[PDB]
Design an enzyme around this catalytic site. Structure first.
Site, PDB file in Angstrom:
ATOM      1  N   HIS A  78       0.834  -1.214   0.000  1.00 29.72           N
ATOM      2  CA  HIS A  78       0.000   0.000   0.000  1.00 29.72           C
ATOM      3  C   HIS A  78       0.861   1.253   0.000  1.00 29.72           C
ATOM      4  O   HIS A  78       0.586   2.203  -0.720  1.00 29.72           O
ATOM      5  CB  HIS A  78      -0.991   0.015   1.176  1.00 29.72           C
ATOM      6  CG  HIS A  78      -1.836  -1.219   1.264  1.00 29.72           C
ATOM      7  ND1 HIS A  78      -2.192  -1.789   2.465  1.00 29.72           N
ATOM      8  CD2 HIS A  78      -2.371  -2.006   0.302  1.00 29.72           C
ATOM      9  CE1 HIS A  78      -2.925  -2.869   2.239  1.00 29.72           C
ATOM     10  NE2 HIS A  78      -3.055  -3.020   0.934  1.00 29.72           N
ATOM     11  N   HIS A 227      -9.116  -1.830  -5.005  1.00 30.63           N
ATOM     12  CA  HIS A 227      -8.039  -2.122  -4.089  1.00 30.63           C
ATOM     13  C   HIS A 227      -7.007  -3.125  -4.636  1.00 30.63           C
ATOM     14  O   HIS A 227      -5.792  -2.952  -4.438  1.00 30.63           O
ATOM     15  CB  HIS A 227      -8.554  -2.606  -2.772  1.00 30.63           C
ATOM     16  CG  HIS A 227      -7.486  -2.641  -1.751  1.00 30.63           C
ATOM     17  ND1 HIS A 227      -6.817  -3.801  -1.433  1.00 30.63           N
ATOM     18  CD2 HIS A 227      -6.893  -1.653  -1.059  1.00 30.63           C
ATOM     19  CE1 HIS A 227      -5.883  -3.518  -0.551  1.00 30.63           C
ATOM     20  NE2 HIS A 227      -5.911  -2.224  -0.308  1.00 30.63           N
ATOM     21  N   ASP A 231      -3.009  -2.702  -4.961  1.00 31.50           N
ATOM     22  CA  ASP A 231      -2.001  -3.734  -4.606  1.00 31.50           C
ATOM     23  C   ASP A 231      -1.044  -4.088  -5.738  1.00 31.50           C
ATOM     24  O   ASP A 231       0.147  -4.279  -5.492  1.00 31.50           O
ATOM     25  CB  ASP A 231      -2.657  -5.050  -4.171  1.00 31.50           C
ATOM     26  CG  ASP A 231      -3.340  -4.939  -2.844  1.00 31.50           C
ATOM     27  OD1 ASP A 231      -2.946  -4.091  -2.033  1.00 31.50           O
ATOM     28  OD2 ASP A 231      -4.298  -5.701  -2.621  1.00 31.50           O
ATOM     29  N   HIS A 254      -0.038 -11.478  -4.814  1.00 32.94           N
ATOM     30  CA  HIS A 254       1.336 -10.989  -4.585  1.00 32.94           C
ATOM     31  C   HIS A 254       2.397 -11.897  -5.145  1.00 32.94           C
ATOM     32  O   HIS A 254       3.427 -11.412  -5.624  1.00 32.94           O
ATOM     33  CB  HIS A 254       1.578 -10.769  -3.090  1.00 32.94           C
ATOM     34  CG  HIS A 254       0.602  -9.825  -2.497  1.00 32.94           C
ATOM     35  ND1 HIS A 254       0.491  -8.524  -2.929  1.00 32.94           N
ATOM     36  CD2 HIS A 254      -0.381 -10.012  -1.589  1.00 32.94           C
ATOM     37  CE1 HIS A 254      -0.514  -7.942  -2.295  1.00 32.94           C
ATOM     38  NE2 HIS A 254      -1.043  -8.816  -1.460  1.00 32.94           N
TER      39      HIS A 254
HETATM   40  O1  LIG Z   1      -7.653 -10.441  -1.335  1.00 35.44           O
HETATM   41  C1  LIG Z   1      -8.116 -10.132  -0.257  1.00 35.44           C
HETATM   42  C2  LIG Z   1      -7.910  -8.725   0.266  1.00 35.44           C
HETATM   43  C3  LIG Z   1      -6.492  -8.255  -0.065  1.00 35.44           C
HETATM   44  C4  LIG Z   1      -5.560  -8.240   1.134  1.00 35.44           C
HETATM   45  N1  LIG Z   1      -6.294  -8.055   2.417  1.00 35.44           N
HETATM   46  C5  LIG Z   1      -6.248  -8.955   3.453  1.00 35.44           C
HETATM   47  O2  LIG Z   1      -5.597  -9.992   3.371  1.00 35.44           O
HETATM   48  C6  LIG Z   1      -6.999  -8.720   4.710  1.00 35.44           C
HETATM   49  C7  LIG Z   1      -6.904  -9.622   5.791  1.00 35.44           C
HETATM   50  C8  LIG Z   1      -7.607  -9.370   6.946  1.00 35.44           C
HETATM   51  C9  LIG Z   1      -8.422  -8.233   7.075  1.00 35.44           C
HETATM   52  C10 LIG Z   1      -9.173  -7.983   8.280  1.00 35.44           C
HETATM   53  C11 LIG Z   1      -9.798  -7.771   9.252  1.00 35.44           C
HETATM   54  C12 LIG Z   1     -10.585  -7.479  10.424  1.00 35.44           C
HETATM   55  C13 LIG Z   1     -11.672  -6.598  10.292  1.00 35.44           C
HETATM   56  C14 LIG Z   1     -12.470  -6.298  11.395  1.00 35.44           C
HETATM   57  C15 LIG Z   1     -12.216  -6.879  12.638  1.00 35.44           C
HETATM   58  C16 LIG Z   1     -11.152  -7.772  12.760  1.00 35.44           C
HETATM   59  C17 LIG Z   1     -10.332  -8.084  11.682  1.00 35.44           C
HETATM   60  C18 LIG Z   1      -8.531  -7.356   5.995  1.00 35.44           C
HETATM   61  C19 LIG Z   1      -7.829  -7.597   4.839  1.00 35.44           C
HETATM   62  C20 LIG Z   1      -4.603  -7.115   0.845  1.00 35.44           C
HETATM   63  O3  LIG Z   1      -4.888  -5.943   1.085  1.00 35.44           O
HETATM   64  N2  LIG Z   1      -3.408  -7.416   0.279  1.00 35.44           N
HETATM   65  O4  LIG Z   1      -2.489  -6.391  -0.007  1.00 35.44           O
HETATM   66  N3  LIG Z   1      -8.829 -11.073   0.412  1.00 35.44           N
HETATM   67  C21 LIG Z   1      -9.444 -10.865   1.732  1.00 35.44           C
HETATM   68  C22 LIG Z   1      -8.655 -11.631   2.812  1.00 35.44           C
HETATM   69  C23 LIG Z   1      -9.583 -12.176   3.901  1.00 35.44           C
HETATM   70  O5  LIG Z   1     -10.809 -12.618   3.293  1.00 35.44           O
HETATM   71 ZN   LIG Z   2      -2.755  -9.059  -0.429  1.00 37.78          ZN
HETATM   72 ZN   LIG Z   3      -3.960  -4.546  -0.158  1.00 34.87          ZN
END
Ligand SMILES: O=C(CC[C@H](NC(=O)c1ccc(C#Cc2ccccc2)cc1)C(=O)NO)NCCCO
Ligand SMILES: [Zn+2]
Ligand SMILES: [Zn+2]
Length: 287
Positions: A78, A227, A231, A254
């Site tokens: 990010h 988003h 990434d 990634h």
């Molecule tokens: O592809 C993706 C997204 C890309 C990824 N984000 C993540 O891994 C990711 C993992 C965990 C969270 C969380 C949380 C939380 C929210 C409220 C209360 C308590 C805890 C948010 C994002 C990311 O930003 N990669 O750069 N899939 C969703 C993952 C899970 O389904």
């Molecule tokens: Zn990711």
């Molecule tokens: Zn991300």
């Protein structure tokens, strides 16, 4: 000419790592020409310095992680997306913990921080890499591709689709604010394994497999795919130079993004460095 760029002043932020839940100070520091982005873990004894380049990507589970030996800097995507977005070539990033802060889940805070430090143009031509020939990598139903294109464009689809050109469309307005996201089912599992510890509705979109649970809703109608574009821009900046081409991502994460970078780099016939002595004729413009 299109000059290289760094920060005018040192600027600091505090936050928490998404996965680690650890409090971390993030200091962005001006750097000279041809430095690139280098990270510095200032909590380790001795401090470990790690260039933000493709070869240093070690793990790729839910974020891009840089490694040197047993030392990691994860969730760089990010912050690097923000850098790419504002065309920052050279900067030091000093971190007090292993993970970059999540801030609001997007690149917005980082974009605003970088701008608040001020941009400083440097007297040296900015080196771009032109995609001369199609380069692609796949694995199962994931695909990552560079296609020649006189400019920079990203198209991405996930399990849904968005295309963004960074001459017609502002990184800042249309991509930068897109927040990371997760499914409750997933989030519950990760929390059970001591992951996503810094997560909240304040820095992540949460959905079950039906609807958005965040009270205040979405920033973009297609925030999720936006988003993922954010990434990819961050992951692609580990190239170490801005790209002139089109990136097409199909469920690409990634790992496969880093694999594309490695293949491109090794396939020298597919690319060439280029500078623009005349900003008017250049295919990519910055602010
Ligand atoms: O592809 C993706 C997204 C890309 C990824 N984000 C993540 O891994 C990711 C993992 C965990 C969270 C969380 C949380 C939380 C929210 C409220 C209360 C308590 C805890 C948010 C994002 C990311 O930003 N990669 O750069 N899939 C969703 C993952 C899970 O389904
Ligand atoms: Zn990711
Ligand atoms: Zn991300």
């Amino acid at each position: 000419m299109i000059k290289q760029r760094t920060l005018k002043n040192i600027i600091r932020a505090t936050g928490v790592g998404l996965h680690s839940g650890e409090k971390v100070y993030l200091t962005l520091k001006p750097a000279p020409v041809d430095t690139g982005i280098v990270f510095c873990r200032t909590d380790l004894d001795p401090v470990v310095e790690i260039p933000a380049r493709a070869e240093n990507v070690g793990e790729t589970t839910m974020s891009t992680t840089l490694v040197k030996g047993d030392v990691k800097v994860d969730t760089v995507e990010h912050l690097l997306s923000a850098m790419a977005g504002l065309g920052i070539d050279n900067a030091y990033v000093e971190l007090s913990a292993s993970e970059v802060p999540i801030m609001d889940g997007s690149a917005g805070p980082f974009v605003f921080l970088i701008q608040s430090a001020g941009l400083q143009e440097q007297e040296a031509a900015k080196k771009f890499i032109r995609i001369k020939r199609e380069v692609s990598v796949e694995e199962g139903d994931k695909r990552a591709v560079f296609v020649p294109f006189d400019g920079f464009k990203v198209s991405f689809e996930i399990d849904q689709q968005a295309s963004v050109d960074f001459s017609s469309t502002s990184f800042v307005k249309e991509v930068s604010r897109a927040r990371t996201f997760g499914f409750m089912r997933d989030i519950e599992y990760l929390r059970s394994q001591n992951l996503a510890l810094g997560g909240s509705v304040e820095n992540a979109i949460v959905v079950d497999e039906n609807r958005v649970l965040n009270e205040d809703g979405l920033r973009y109608e297609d925030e999720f795919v936006k988003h993922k574009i954010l990434d990819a821009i961050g992951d692609l900046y580990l190239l170490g130079n801005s790209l002139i081409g089109e990136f097409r991502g199909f469920k690409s994460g990634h790992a496969l993004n880093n694999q594309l970078l490695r293949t491109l780099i090794a396939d020298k016939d597919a690319w060439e460095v280029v500078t623009f002595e005349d900003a008017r004729t250049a295919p990519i413009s910055y602010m």
